[PDB]
Design a protein around this ligand. Sequence first.
Ligand SMILES: CO[C@@H]1C[C@H](c2ccnc(N3CC[C@@H](F)C3)n2)CN(C(=O)c2c[nH]c(C#N)c2)C1
Ligand SMILES: [Cl-]
Lengths: 335, 265
Amino acid sequence: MDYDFKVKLSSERERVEDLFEYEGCKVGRGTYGHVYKAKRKDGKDDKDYALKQIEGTGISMSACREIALLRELKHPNVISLQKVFLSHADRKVWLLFDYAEHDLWHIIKFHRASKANLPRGMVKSLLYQILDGIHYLHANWVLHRDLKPANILVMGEGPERGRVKIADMGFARTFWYRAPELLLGARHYTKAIDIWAIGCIFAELLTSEPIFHCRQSNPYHHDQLDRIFNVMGFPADKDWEDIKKMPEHSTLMKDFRRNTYTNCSLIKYMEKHKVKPDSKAFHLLQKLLTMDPIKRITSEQAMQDPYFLEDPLPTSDVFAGCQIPYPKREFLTEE
Amino acid sequence: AMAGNFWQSSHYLQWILDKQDLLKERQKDLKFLSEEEYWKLQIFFTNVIQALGEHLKLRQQVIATATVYFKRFYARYSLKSIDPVLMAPTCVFLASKVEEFGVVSNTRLIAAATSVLKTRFSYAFPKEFPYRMNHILECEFYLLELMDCCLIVYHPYRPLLQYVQDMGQEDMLLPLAWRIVNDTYRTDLCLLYPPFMIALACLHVACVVQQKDARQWFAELSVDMEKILEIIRVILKLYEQWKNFDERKEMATILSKMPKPKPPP
Ligand SMILES: CO[C@@H]1C[C@H](c2ccnc(N3CC[C@@H](F)C3)n2)CN(C(=O)c2c[nH]c(C#N)c2)C1
Ligand SMILES: [Cl-]
């Protein structure tokens, strides 16, 4: 490497530790890496930022997909990548975004903890915005592959108040959000797999409970499938014709009997959680939660559902001007 | 992944360059090499990347993406900034990750570069490949930042398949037009024109070669045929250069004239 080229680059190189104040401000730690609530040290902005140190050193498949995709994707419901910092000494990659004070994991946890001890169209607006961001990804042949409440961020106070931001494109290639074809050995991720995850989220927004909640290498997972059949019922041959084609179909036949789930249906489940089966919300949930992926509704068809034309209409701000009762995120003392 | 998004992509918005800006940045290397020798070096390194990709059993799309990363790097930076012998396998290694082929192991990437240069390019390289994985990893960081993290690259292959399918001439024209698209990587075309325009120029040259009348199909296109003719002239010029160039006889001399990285004090 040319020395003059190297010192010039090193002199011009923006370092994350010099630009942002984030030590002690970790709000997330997972397979994605570490997410911090950061502030600019130069103080020309008073905005909060989200700084992510990607997991591992160098550019993994995960980091590569997240950078490659977020560098192109531009949609109001997809988290926007501002900057990439490449720390040469430790080979760490940092990604900068706007800070979303909220996410669906915390919002749902807040409602769940309340039932133990929402504005009218908040759930509808969250679903419409998730559908809008996923439809943009799918129109661009991008599968999320890991949709869950935790990576569905929602902006707090500011110019984008209550706007959903879909996060985490780094899934390069619990199971409560995994479509049943994945649990039966499906060899590829599809748009339908994302749609099933959106259906799980929608049901959880309506009831505050993970619809396919289940106890903690092989793609086949008995208890998770059992929970799905306890909620949905056991698929008949006519409901999912190509189920015979799944690699784990004979394992499903050996471990399960249809009659066990004879009084099981999405209608009965949602009835227990006080959601009316005759509502447009229920009919849309059922179209998203279809066992056979080829029979699952598309994100664009979901956006056209009459549920979104029924009062109340979805709003740009999911909180619809209402005081946000949700607390701010807590800082993890990561050691 | 990102198919259909060309007009809103970083490839179009940042990496479709102005020919004069490109020629201006090249002047620093043209102090050591003639324009002809600089072109021959780009032909040479496109062939090195192709050979590295073949050795690693990579799909043509991975090889093409790696070739574009290499061209984008030397479109903005001098041949002396980083050794192109280290840059070429580094481009292949990163493209294989972007194209979701996988992480080529340290031993596999180093053995493939050592083996390809030794068995296929010893006319240009008397010594064995001297770089190790730490160098490739260092280079990867530099290549990523110096491309502004733009990893999604569009190639003429997909629009070409759509055009020959529309023509109903796949069996006759696709093999040749596809090979001509491979040849366009020996030139600066991917840095100057949208891929669908390079695909049309290749398809046009294939029709001329195979004496297939396609004037009406080409006239029914809502495209700037002047830009298509500019690309066709670049392809015809490459064939004349290819004919007059003997890469095996000339590359050891051209590589010696090339500016080399300055060591630290
Ligand atoms: C309270 O625990 C979490 C806070 C996390 C958070 C808070 C604010 N901003 C972000 N991001 C901005 C853009 C991305 F870098 C993520 N992430 C989100 N959560 C996660 O699980 C999570 C799953 N995948 C990713 C990623 N990547 C995060 C819950
Ligand atoms: Cl069903």
